Chains A and B, each alone.
Chain A
Amino acid sequence: ATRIDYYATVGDPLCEYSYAKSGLGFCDLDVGFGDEAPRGVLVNIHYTARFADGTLFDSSYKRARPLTMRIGVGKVIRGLDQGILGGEGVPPMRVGGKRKLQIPPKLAYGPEPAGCFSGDCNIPGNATLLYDINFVEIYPGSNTR
């Protein structure tokens, strides 16, 4: 619920969510140009993650570095893997690409308050998160393992 870790950003372009069959609200903004997002490698992304009403709780620009995630092998949320690679034929991301995502709680952290360090929690139950992924690059040296 609370602990937004207040980081006033500017916002991102709004666009309608061409939903997926797995419940994922999927929304491409800027199609990348380069190699596809490979299933199993470290990929550097930038993102702004927002709750339902739009409040920001996490962003890679807050820590001023791309986020290095291993996509596909479940190190991340299922919404992230299904909105970066695409399971049900959803188009994957390319390098230098941007993409909006409305992560549903079925794919997001369930009805479980993911992250509860003292009294209050980073994520509330049934959050229906909102990600704004900016795929910046693949990790320059990466393995499919």
Chain B
Amino acid sequence: PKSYSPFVDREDGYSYYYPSDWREFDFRAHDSAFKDRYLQLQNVRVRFIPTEKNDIHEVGPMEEVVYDLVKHKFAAPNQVATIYDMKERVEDGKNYYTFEYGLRTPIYATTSFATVAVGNNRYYTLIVGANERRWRKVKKQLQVVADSLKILQ
């Protein structure tokens, strides 16, 4: 974490970082969402679903859960969802799904290096996005932010 900040939420569980002096703002229904004051869709957000599980490798496989998370629970029908590579890690004792997709409407070229996790009767779906017109320059920064989500008890 060079120019980064470990924003912890000890009442919720999630903790992660921000690239460079990103502001805080209220999303529609997410908690943090932390946009960046000049770009519009260059923001990192995260939420919960009160599930009844503890591991993400039992609700379904990664290659099968990213499909119905992106094509059926993120992307609207008006946009096509070019799901890029999906990767897996293990932090302490928990699996770690992190993937990449591009929601291409006929307009509005954008993409998102979202990750997903679970724990404590919650389902963490930390999303971070940007514009596809300027994504290759801001790829690794949002990558190292997206894999930096941590869950703790």
Contacts and interface: CB of A to CB of B under 8 A. Distances in A.
Direct contact of A and B (CB under 8 A): yes
Nearest to A144: B106
A73 B80 CA distance: 9
Contact of B106 (A74, A87, A145): A145
A39 interface: yes
A132 interface: no
Nearest to B79: A73
Nearest to A78: B77
Interface bin, chain B = under 10
Contacts of A144: 106
Contacts of B71: 87
Interface in B83-142: 106-107
B106 A81 contact: no
Nearest to B72: A87
Contacts of B76: 74
A18 to B, nearest CB: 21
Question: Which of A40, A72, A143 lies at the interface centre, i.e. has the most chain B CB atoms within 10 A of its CB?
Answer: A40
Given A87-B71, A145-B106, A39 B80 contact: yes
A72 to B, nearest CB: 7
6 contacts: A40-B80, A72-B80, A74-B77, A74-B78, A81-B77, A144-B106
- Sorted nearest first, the 3 A-B pairs with minimum C-beta distance are A74-B77, A145-B106, A73-B78
